Every structure is written in C-alpha cells, then in structure tokens.
C-alpha cells in the first residue's frame, strides 16, 4: 500500500531538462525529507523512483539517506550504482527493478519486516503506473502556484481540480501558503476514496450542545478557511433581518479574521477577485479623489450605482454632480475635516493628512500607539453618498521591523465586499511597509455588522464546495523609483501565481 | 467506593435557614442538580434534608435514595449507608452523591469524598446552617489534603441571584497527516498559564487571564511613550455576555465607583477632571497636571482640563473647544443622541456608531482617546450588543476598567431604548503589559475567578433618557473579588 509524493505546477508540470522547473524551494525539500524519512525503531521507509529521477538528483545526495532506494530501470544496473559512489556503513544497498510491479514484489519478498512505508517519488512513468495499478492510498502534493516551462507532467487524475480549473482522490489536508525565491506553494494530502476528568463530564453533558465548507478537509491550515467558515457560521447561526436595501440580510455582530503577509498575499482563490478593481480604488483613495467617474473610466464600476442621479437624490444631495461621492474615504484620509465643495476642487493643504502622519510616525517613532487613520467624520456623513464601511485602520511595528495593520469595518457584505476589502487593506499594508522600509507581516480584519444578503446564499453555498488554492504573491515593481506613498502607479504591481476558481455572479444590493 | 458532595452555598458557606433554602428558586441549579445526580445512582441525605423536600419530589426519582435518620420509617449513620451500598446494590449502583450539614461534615471528617460539586451563590443570605470549612475554602471568599477546583463554569442567574458551578477534587488519515503536522510544528521557555489546574474553563474571565498569559508568553518587548517599557501584541479580542451577569472582574477588586463616575462624566460632555477628583476619582489627575499639559505643548490649559476629549466628542463632535468651563450646548454633533434615536426608530441601521477620534482636535487633548469607537447592534429578539474598539490597552490597569465601562454603557443604552443587554465585544489594537506590572499580574494569574456579580439599574421608571442616570441609580449585587492589587500608572 503506497503513497505518492510530488511537487507540481497548476498544469501538472513536474520537470524540464531532467531537472526541476522552479528555483530552489527549501521548505518543500524539508517536507520531502520529513515525509519520506520518519518512522516510529527497527524499520526504514523505501523510496521508489525512475531512472531519470535518479539521474536528476545530485550525486552527493544520492542515494537518499536512511531510506531504501529502489530504481526502476532496464538499462541501469545495481553495480552501475554501486560503482558511482561507495555505500556508507549502515545504509541499504540500492536495488534496481524492471517495473513498478517488480519493485513492489521485491519489497514483499525481501523486505517484509524491514520496510514500513513505501513512497513513489517520480517521475511520470512511475506516477502513472502507480495510479494505473491503483495501489496509491495517499498523494502528498506540493502545489506550486506559478507556471513554469515543463516537459514532464504528472498524469491527469480524478480530483485533479485541486490544481486548476477544468475512485477519486479527495483532499484531507490543505496547509497555509509558503514561499521561497518568489514562488508561492502549499501542501495538500489527498486520500483515495471511491474519575480523573471523567466525573466532570456530566456537568459538561448538560451545559453542552449544518452548512460547512469542504468538510472532508480535516486539517484546515489555509487562511482562506477563515472566510469560508465565516460564511458558514453566518448562515448557520446568524439572524435574518431587514436592511437599508430592502434585500433581506442574515447577520452576525463582531467578527474577526487575520491574514499573513510575509509569505504570500490573501487574494481569495475560491472565486476570482477583481484585482484591477482593488488596485485602482486604493490608488484613487490615496489621491484623495472623490470622482467615481475616474474609476468608471478605467473599467472599475464599483461606485457607479451609489453615485447615480437617483441614488444621490435618495440621499438628499440634489446639488451633487453624478459620480461625486462627496467628502468620503480618500478625502477624509488626506484632508480630514476640510470643507467640501465638489469633486473638481483642489483641497491641497486643507484639513488633516492622516496618511502622511501615519507614515511619518512609522518612519520616526514606530512604537507610538496613535498610528491611526479614520474616514468616519460625523460632521460630514450627510454629505457623503455613502457613509464609509471601512472606517478606521491602525498600524503597528514590532521588534523586527515587521508591519501589521488592523482595519475596522462597520458593515460587511460577506459575499461581495469582504474579499475585496481583505485585498485592499492588505495591499495598503504592502505599500506602507515599502515606503517606510518595513516588512509586511499581518492584516487583521475587525468586523461589525457582518452579513450575507439573501440573494447571495445559493451562490455562497456553491462557493463552499470549492477547496482553496495556494495564495498568490504580489510584488511591487520599480521599488527604487518608489519612495513616497503618492509615487505608486497602476503599473507598479505584479500578481504572481493566482489560480482562483471561476467568478461567481453576485448582485450588489443597491 | 467513590463519594461526591453536591451543594449550593453562599460565600460565607451558608446552605440553609429554617429547614429550607436561603435563596429564591434557582432554576438552572436545579437542572444541574438533576443531571449530575443521574447517569442507577444513589443520593444520600440527612433526616432534616428529607423533610425540607416537597413531597411531590420526595422520592428523588431515577436514583436510589437513602435517609440517614435514627428516627424514621434508611440507615443510622453515613458509614452504615455506605455499607448498605456495597453489600446490596453492588451491581447497578454507579456513583454515590451526598446531598445536609452533619452529613456533609461526616463525609469530610471520614475523608471519603473525592469531589465537591459546588454551586457558588454569589449573594449572601441569612442562614442558620453552614457548610463546613475545608481546605480549598478560598474558592468561596477571601477569608494535609486539599480540594482544588478543576472546573469553573460561566456565571448564571435566576431571580436576581448570580451563581457559578465549580467542581473540586481532593488532591490512517491521521497517520497520513502526522508527519506533515510534525514538521510544520517543529520550529518553534517556561510558559505561564492562569490556574493550570482548572481544565474546564467556562468562566468568561478566563479570556482576560488567558490574554495576560498570552502577552507575557508571546508578546514582544518594546519601548513606549512613558519610558516604562511594555510587552505587547496587536489585535486582540474578548467578548462578555451581559444577559445573566455583569463582567466586573473578580481576580482583583475593580474600582466600580470610578467606572460609574467616569462614564456619567463622559455622558455629560464634561472635560473638567477636577469634577472627578473632587468625588474621589483621581484616575485622570496625572495626565492633567501643569507638568503633563506642558509636555503636551498645552501651557494655556488649566490644571484638570482634558481638552476636547472623550465626552466632548461624544456629545459635541467637531465643535470648537475653548476651555472646560464653557457651555457647548447645541454645538457639534450629538452622536450619543443620534445613536439612541436610531436604536429607537430603525434598529437595523448599520451606522449606529460613536467615535472619539477626531484628527483635527488630537493635539488639543491631554491624551488621545484610547477607547475611540463603539458600535451598537440589535437582533430580532430586541437584544442589544456593543462593540468597542480600543487603540491602546493597558492590560493590567486599564482593561478591566474599560470592560466594566462599556458593559455599563450597554446596560444604560439598552434601558432607555427598551432593549435587553446581550453582549459586549472588546476589540483591541496595541495590547500591552507594562514591565512593572508583570510580577503583580503573575500573582493575579494564581487566582481562581469568582462568579460575576449582577448590576441592577435602580429607579427604572424615572429613567427615560440617557442624561437621566445619576451615580445613585445602580446597585452591584453579589460582588466577591479577591483583594486589590497595586499597579502603578505609567504616566
Ligand atoms: N516535481 C517533482 O515532484 C518531481 C519532478 N521530477 C523530474 O521529472 C522529470 C524526470 O522524470 P521522468 O522524465 O518521468 O523520468 P523517470 O524518473 O520516470 O525515468 C524514466 C524511465 O524510468 C524507468 N521506467 C519508468 N517507468 C517505467 C515503467 N513504467 N516501466 C518500466 N520502466 C520504467 C525507465 O528507465 P529505462 O529507460 O532505464 O528503462 C523509463 O524510461 C524530471 O524533471 C525529474 O527531475 C521527478 C520527481 C519528482
Ligand atoms: N444548599 C444546599 O445545597 C442544601 C441545603 N440544605 C439545608 O439543610 C438544612 C438541613 O441541614 P441539617 O440541618 O444539617 O439537616 P440534615 O439533613 O443533616 O438532618 C439532620 C440530622 O440528620 C441525621 N443525622 C445527621 N448526621 C448524623 C450523624 N452524624 N449520625 C447519625 N444521624 C445523623 C440526623 O437525624 P436524627 O435526629 O433523626 O438522628 C441529624 O439530626 C436546611 O436548610 C436544608 O434545606 C439541605 C440540602 C442541600
Ligand atoms: C468592497 C468593496 C468595494 N466595492 C464598493 C461597494 C459599494 C457598494 C456596495 N454595496 C453593497 N451592498 N455591497 C458591497 O459590497 C458594496 C461595495 C465593490 C462594489 C462592487 C463590487 C463588485 O460588484 N464586484 C463584482 C462585480 C463587478 C466586476 O467584477 O466588475 C466581482 O465579482 O468582482 C466589488 C466591490
Ligand atoms: C481605563 C481607564 C480609566 N483610567 C484613565 C487612565 C489614564 C491614564 C492611563 N495611563 C496608563 N498608562 N494606563 C492606564 O490604564 C491609564 C488609564 C484609569 C486610570 C487609573 C486607574 C487606576 O486604578 N489607577 C490606580 C493606580 C494609580 C497609581 O498609583 O499609579 C489606583 O490606585 O486605583 C484606573 C483607570
Ligand atoms: N514534493 C516533492 N518535492 C520534490 O522536490 C520532490 N523531488 C523529487 C525528486 N528530486 C529530488 C532532488 C533532491 C532531493 C534531495 O536532495 N533531498 C534531500 C533533502 C534534504 C533536506 O532538505 O532535509 C533528502 O535527503 O531528502 C530530493 C529529491 C521527488 N519528489 C518530490 N516531491
Ligand atoms: N447544588 C445543589 N442545589 C440544590 O438545590 C440542592 N438541593 C438539595 C436538596 N433539596 C432539593 C429540593 C428539590 C429537588 C428536586 O426537586 N430535584 C428534582 C427536580 C429538579 C427540577 O425541578 O428541575 C430532580 O430530580 O432533580 C432536589 C433537591 C440538595 N443538594 C443541592 N445541591
Ligand atoms: O467597502 C465596503 C463598502 C460597502 N460594503 C457593503 C456594506 C453593506 O452590505 C452595504 C453598505 O450599506 P450600509 O451598511 O451603509 O447600509 O455596504 C462592504 O461590504 N464593503
Ligand atoms: O481608557 C484607557 C485609557 C488609557 N489606557 C492606557 C493606554 C496606554 O497604555 C496608555 C495611554 O497612552 P498612549 O497609548 O496614548 O501612549 O493608556 C487604557 O488602557 N485605557
């Protein structure tokens, strides 16, 4: 009964020119070593590999230490390998077999009592045979999120949708996202399916008491499970309420998520997020811009329905031109408290530039505890097309020059807005880290009224049947040119290794 | 042979009076009692205790009963009743429970009880029968084998009586996954933990105790404005239920008078700290001395003037500040009034927030506000919840005070809106322990929490609007904390 261990691009690519397609992934090698070596004593595990895989390995590491090595080949002989390098004392002699079935026979015949687990370690010849024989119980797959030139591929398999969009192999384990050398990746395991404190439990018994994301996944390390579980939690436990929009709501109050920013970027994968939209909106905020036509004109229409003639009038703002969000978000960030006129006015130097203050405090006194920016100005709310939802953020620097950010959001459309908000403030954290010579560490999301609209519930349930993919990496390009927060442009960003499931249509509650 | 005692007692160990119970009917305690005693089982009770039971329940059903009188229609002693359980009933008897005094004290002297199931009634009541003193006693009030708590429930209440439940003891797919979890856990000296002997930690105060432990264990050592130094973390969260009891911390006495007076002071939009100090509430004095104000570049401020902070922003957001003797009536935005009006007319609105954070006015304040935003929420059962966001949290000194403060605001706002208080949710930014508090906090972490008290609003009929509350309209009922712990304020 065998296990497969592999690293794989989303297109199932595993090799090129008898080498690996990506730069060195040190955590993946640790993992490989740890999975293939470990045992309870008497025994060792075996690794079975094809001839070219054996040849692809550097001499100094071959044979793989403390594991019985078997090579499947018809041309290489056991004495070829013995001649390559002296067998070290205590290690096993390297065996050669003509086929995978022969390797498994040999294991039974001559190494019962001696080997514990059997691992098939590549290449495509062996992976294919192992799947054909149906002898693989588990797949240890390292999912590399970037595509690389490959000439060798892991075979198609039922359940290969954990890699990319199109007996079965279902994931029972999904880790958080790692990275090395600009490459994001994660680890999954698939499974072939087809009176101490005794007497305390009756008090527990009487004090004690449906929708769930991909419930077969038992180890839920991927940080996107916070979002997926929050959807389920609201649907299971939330309360059905009315709402400003007339569309129903199911709501909860006081919710929390947090996303690491040191290895990869929390752009959700369980549906495609509108990244051009987040980037363009954030730059617009940073400008202090209140003209949503500037967004609309670039193909970002997110503010259009709340800046129509009709919606502005429902807000008693007949004097606003279409597109004018009033003194909201970016205006309050860059010009807190300034007297608003319209979206065409120059406000340079009016009011408080909170963003500048935060940055200057980060650069000069990062232990200060007042590094906040707010968009909630009670005096100006009635002049806004919409009172801000994400209304405050706070920054923090630790010991090691690592920057974390908290954002408070009064109102959270879990279906439509939340993924977008996660990406937006995570990006702001990247931008601020760079300009302050800091390392981005963490985004922390504090949520007030956290809701899913009734007309989203069905689509959200489909979303919960999808397992997450490894997070992408976002790189800031042209770092040397970029010295201040206003220097960033729409071209200074690269999203690397993003492989989300398909878009899900969800109407905005207007 | 294993024996357990089931009891409910006041902090002074009171269990009865005039052959009855001291307190009004405790519904949940009775459930608890029912369950615990059956899973047949034997309950064993003294003569008088049998009488006290109403006849409709007198045979305690689904359990063997034993009365230990020497005068009735049934053993003559407690040793006797234990013999009668080995000899006969040896089979089909699981555990045995003793359920009066005399019986309790017999069971303790003979040393046969291995566990104590105690319902701690938080209030005192007249009693003439008391549970025996016993080592482990401090679990009730502040007054060799010993009894150690192993379980401490959340706080309940019925008929205006707060109470707790504690238990004391006499003293392939997982295989596939394993190697992967193991390496992920590897990286990565002696952790502290609040009362590690308590396994089942239902008491909501454990959030605060665990928070202290987590900061000291996993926080990073940093500098800070005051010069004292802290250990800090960022982004922490607690929540306290308000429907049964009130989260006034019990592992050290919280300064309740101070909480109440500061809050009423906020609500009036008062910015003169001498009004607090003149009432014996000196919490703001060191941040409004001549010296501190000058350090803030405020030489023109009069001693005691906090500037346009907290309450001023609540009641007059954005108004132009003069001094603390000015009348600001009608000026600025009355956020508190707006919040209340929205709660009363359209409680599904998602903009029910109040902020103290006004960037245009920060430099004019003695201290930028720590608790700077709160948001309210109503469900479909008319239950009110409140979230407060705090940018900077002095865990040892400030946090217990802040918890009580906003929980109290929640009770007040619920009342004038004809809602019921449900939950206070505490969101924390820079969450820190000052270096000179660490030792004191380590003492505190050795204390088992007591049941939370309940706070009642008095004269409810007179109180219609948030401004109507006075310092005399509240009663804290059943508060039984451990002693105060001195913690010096970093200025
Ligand atoms: N990303 C990853 O996880 C991994 C990537 N790689 C790499 O993948 C590509 C190399 O693998 P691949 O090209 O498939 O090389 P293989 O390791 O499969 O070696 C190829 C050959 O191995 C022996 N052979 C294999 N299958 C059979 C069979 N089914 N029956 C009989 N003999 C068999 C044969 O050698 P003979 O001709 O002597 O008979 C066949 O020619 C490389 O890039 C290697 O580095 C490898 C392992 C893992
Ligand atoms: N808070 C709680 O959890 C509980 C409180 N209570 C309160 O109990 C009061 C009664 O307790 P208490 O007055 O101590 O009543 P008991 O139930 O202990 O009855 C007293 C007597 O019981 C039999 N007895 C007890 N001890 C001995 C002994 N050591 N040797 C021989 N016989 C013994 C005797 O009756 P005889 O004279 O016939 O020999 C002794 O006089 C009430 O207020 C009752 O409600 C009771 C249960 C629980
Ligand atoms: C949060 C936030 C910012 N916002 C601003 C914004 C404004 C009003 C709102 N109103 C409501 N009820 N919910 C929102 O989330 C919301 C968000 C967004 C608005 C729309 C989309 C959106 O429609 N996303 C879709 C469809 C459009 C597209 O892709 O072009 C998507 O699936 O990407 C995203 C973000
Ligand atoms: C929260 C809040 C409101 N506040 C306001 C307030 C002002 C400045 C602060 N400064 C610091 N560093 N931490 C605080 O918690 C703090 C709190 C409080 C202030 C003091 C006490 C208090 O109990 N002080 C102690 C110790 C005085 C001393 O000797 O230093 C006392 O003796 O009671 C409580 C609440
Ligand atoms: N997930 C996965 N990642 C891989 O890199 C991988 N590689 C191969 C084949 N190629 C190689 C090449 C070198 C070493 C190697 O030197 N291994 C050392 C790593 C030691 C360590 O980091 O502790 C070993 O002793 O395992 C292993 C396999 C087969 N399955 C894989 N599977
Ligand atoms: N913790 C504790 N609380 C008590 O009230 C208590 N009471 C007694 C003695 N008095 C009483 C009185 C009535 C019932 C009683 O009627 N018990 C029923 C019903 C419980 C219910 O009404 O839900 C039972 O079988 O549990 C039990 C004990 C002994 N130990 C106690 N221990
Ligand atoms: O950044 C944003 C902006 C808006 N929304 C959705 C929040 C709500 O479901 C609706 C906003 O309307 P009110 O909360 O103002 O009713 O905003 C978000 O989730 N994120
Ligand atoms: O309600 C309050 C007021 C103050 N503090 C303590 C917060 C800090 O440790 C110190 C305030 O100083 P700065 O955060 O402003 O530096 O305030 C609180 O914990 N709660």
For residue B104, the domain's CATH number is 3.40.430.10
- R_g of chain A computed on alpha carbons: 28
What are the residues facing B317 on neighbouring strands? B333
Dist. CA B291–CA A287, nearest whole Å? 40
Residue A63 preceded by cis peptide, ω within 30: yes
CA A103 centroid distance within chain? 39
Residue A242 preceded by cis peptide, ω within 30: no
Residues B126 and B56 occupy one common structural domain: yes
Neighbours of A499 (CB within 10 A): 21
Q: Are A9 and A142 in contact (CB under 8 A)?
A: no
Backbone torsions φ then ψ of A153, nearest 5 degrees: -130, 145
CB contact under 8 A, B151 and A218: no
Residue B262 preceded by cis peptide, ω within 30: no
CB contact under 8 A, B220 and A191: no
- 3 state DSSP class of A117: strand
Dist. CA A410–CA A390, nearest whole Å? 6
**Domain-terminating residue out of A151, A174, A194:** A194
Count the residues in chain A: 510
Pairing status of strand A44-50 against strand A115-120: parallel
| Angle made by CA atoms B329, B332, B336, in degrees to the nearest 5 | 85
Q: Are B103 and B46 in contact (CB under 8 A)?
A: yes
Task: Annotate A423-454 with DSSP letters as a single string.
Answer: HHHHHHHHHHHHHTT-EEEEEEEEEEEEEEEG
Q: B232-245 in b/e burial notation, b at 16+ Cβ within 10 A?
A: bbbbbbbbbbbebb
| Largest pairwise CA distance in chain B | 88
Backbone torsions φ then ψ of B477, nearest 5 degrees: -115, 125
DSSP category for residue A140: E
Residues A363 and A421 occupy one common structural domain: yes
**Any ligand 4 atom below 6 A from CB of B488:** yes
- 3 state DSSP class of B157: strand
Residue the block writes with tokens 């860059």: A334
Ligand 6 mean position, distance from CA B33 (Å): 6
Nearest ligand (C-alpha, residue B231): 8
Dist. CA A442–CA A426, nearest whole Å? 8
Q: Are B454 and B160 in contact (CB under 8 A)?
A: yes
Helix residue ranges, H only, B377-434 = 398-416
Residue the block writes with tokens 């974390």: A404
Backbone torsions φ then ψ of A204, nearest 5 degrees: -65, -40
- Angle A275-287/A417-435 helices, nearest 10 degrees? 60
Resolution in units of Å: 2.2
**Domain-terminating residue out of A178, A194, A210:** A194
B394 carries a ligand binding annotation: yes
CATH assignment of the domain containing A341: 3.30.572.10
Q: B155-193 in b/e burial notation, b at 16+ Cβ within 10 A?
A: bbbbeebbbbbbbbbbeeeeebbebbeebbeeeeeeeee
Pairing status of strand A2-8 against strand A136-144: parallel
Residue the block writes with tokens 């004038």: B416
Structure tokens at A330: 């970016």
Nearest CA to ligand 8 atom 1: B370
Describe the strand order of the beta sheet including A372-374 as a list of residue ranges: A239-241, A249-260, A439-453, A402-413, A390-397, A372-374
Residue the block writes with tokens 């229609």: B73
- 3 state DSSP class of A295: helix
Solved by what technique?
X-ray
**Any ligand 8 atom below 6 A from CB of B426:** no
Q: Are B309 and B294 in contact (CB under 8 A)?
A: no
Ligand 2 mean position, distance from CA B52 (Å): 10
Residues B165 and B181 occupy one common structural domain: no
What are the residues facing A15 on neighbouring strands? A152
Task: Annotate B219-286 with DSSP letters as a single string.
Answer: -EEE--TTSS-EEEEEEEEEEEE-SS-----TTTT--HHHHHHHHHHHHTT--BTHHHHTTT--TTGG
- Sign of the C-alpha dihedral, residues B125, B130, B131, B132? positive
Residues B338 and B243 occupy one common structural domain: yes
Nearest ligand (C-alpha, residue A305): 3
From A78's Cα to the closest Cα of chain B, the distance in A is 31
Report the number of distinct structural domains present in chain B. 3
What are the residues facing B386 on neighbouring strands? B376, B424
Dist. CA A229–CA A231, nearest whole Å? 5
Pairing status of strand A169-174 against strand A183-192: antiparallel
**Domain-terminating residue out of B190, B205, B220:** B205
Neighbours of B149 (CB within 10 A): 20
Residues A147 and A69 occupy one common structural domain: yes
Residues B33 and B140 occupy one common structural domain: yes
Residues A375 and A457 occupy one common structural domain: yes
Residues B264 and B381 occupy one common structural domain: yes
Residues A175 and A275 occupy one common structural domain: no
Dist. CA B335–CA B310, nearest whole Å? 12
Q: Which of B95, B153, B373 sits opposite A392 (nearest CB)?
A: B373
Residues B185 and B254 occupy one common structural domain: no
Dist. CA B79–CA A324, nearest whole Å? 86
Dist. CA B444–CA B19, nearest whole Å? 39
Residues B74 and B139 occupy one common structural domain: yes
Dist. CA B226–CA A367, nearest whole Å? 11
Full domain range(s) for residue B114: 1-171
Q: Are B320 and B307 in contact (CB under 8 A)?
A: no
Dist. CA B356–CA B317, nearest whole Å? 8
CA A353 centroid distance within chain? 33
Dist. CA B115–CA B171, nearest whole Å? 10
Dist. CA A290–CA A326, nearest whole Å? 6
Q: Are B238 and B215 in contact (CB under 8 A)?
A: no
The contacts of residue B382 (CB under 8 Å, 6+ apart) are: B418, B419, B420
Residues B297 and B160 occupy one common structural domain: no
Backbone torsions φ then ψ of A149, nearest 5 degrees: -55, 125
């Amino acid at each position: 009964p065998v296990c497969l261990v592999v690293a794989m691009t989303p297109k199932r690519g595993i090799g090129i020119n008898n080498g690996l397609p990506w730069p060195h992934l040190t955590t993946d090698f640790k993992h490989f070593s740890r999975v293939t070596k470990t045992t309870p004593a008497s025994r060792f595990n075996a690794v079975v590999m094809g001839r070219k895989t054996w040849e692809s390995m550097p001499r100094k590491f071959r044979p793989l230490v403390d594991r019985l090595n078997i090579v499947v080949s018809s041309s290489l002989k056991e004495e070829d390998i013995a001649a390559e390098k002296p067998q070290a004392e205590g290690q096993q002699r390297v065996r050669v077999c003509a086929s995978l079935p022969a390797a498994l026979s040999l294991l039974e015949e001559e190494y019962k009592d001696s080997v514990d687990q059997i691992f098939v370690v590549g290449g495509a010849g062996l992976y294919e045979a192992a799947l054909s024989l149906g002898v693989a119980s588990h797949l240890y797959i390292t999912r590399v999120a970037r595509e690389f030139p490959c000439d060798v591929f892991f075979p198609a398999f039922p359940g290969d949708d954990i890699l990319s969009n199109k007996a079965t192999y279902r994931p029972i384990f999904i880790s958080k996202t790692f990275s090395d050398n600009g490459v994001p990746y994660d680890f999954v395991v698939l499974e072939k399916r087809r009176s101490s404190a005794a007497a305390i439990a009756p008090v527990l018994a009487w004090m004690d008491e449906l929708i769930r994301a991909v419930p077969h996944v038992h180890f839920r390390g991927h940080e996107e499970f916070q979002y997926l579980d929050l959807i389920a939690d609201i649907i299971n436990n939330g309360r059905t309420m009315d709402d400003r929009t007339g569309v129903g709501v199911i709501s909860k109050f006081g919710c929390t998520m947090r996303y690491s920013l040191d290895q990869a970027f929390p752009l959700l994968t369980t549906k495609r997020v509108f990244w051009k939209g987040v980037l363009e909106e954030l730059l617009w905020f940073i400008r202090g811009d209140t003209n949503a036509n500037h967004l609309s004109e670039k193909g970002v229409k997110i503010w259009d329905k709340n800046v129509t003639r009709e919606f502005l009038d429902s807000r008693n703002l007949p004097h606003r031109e279409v597109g004018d969000i009033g003194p909201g978000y970016g205006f309050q960030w860059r010009h807190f408290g300034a007297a608003y006129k319209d979206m065409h006015t120059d406000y340079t130097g009016q009011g408080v530039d909170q963003l500048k203050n935060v940055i200057q405090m980060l650069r000069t006194n990062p232990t200060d505890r007042r590094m906040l920016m707010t968009a909630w100005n009670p005096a100006a709310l009635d002049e806004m097309a919409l009172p801000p939802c994400h209304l405050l953020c706070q920054f923090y620097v630790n010991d090691q020059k690592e920057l974390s950010c908290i954002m408070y959001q009064r109102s959270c459309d879990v279906g439509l807005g939340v993924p977008f908000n996660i990406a937006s403030y995570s990006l702001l954290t990247l931008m601020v880290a760079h300009v302050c010579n800091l390392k981005p560490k963490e985004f922390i999301h504090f949520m007030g009224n956290t809701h899913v609209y009734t007309n989203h519930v069905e689509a959200l349930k489909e979303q919960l049947r999808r397992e997450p993919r490894p997070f992408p990496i976002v790189n800031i390009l042209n770092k040397e040119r970029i010295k201040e927060i206003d220097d960033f442009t729409a071209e200074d960003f690269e999203v690397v290794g993003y492989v989300p499931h398909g878009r899900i249509q969800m109407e905005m509650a207007v």
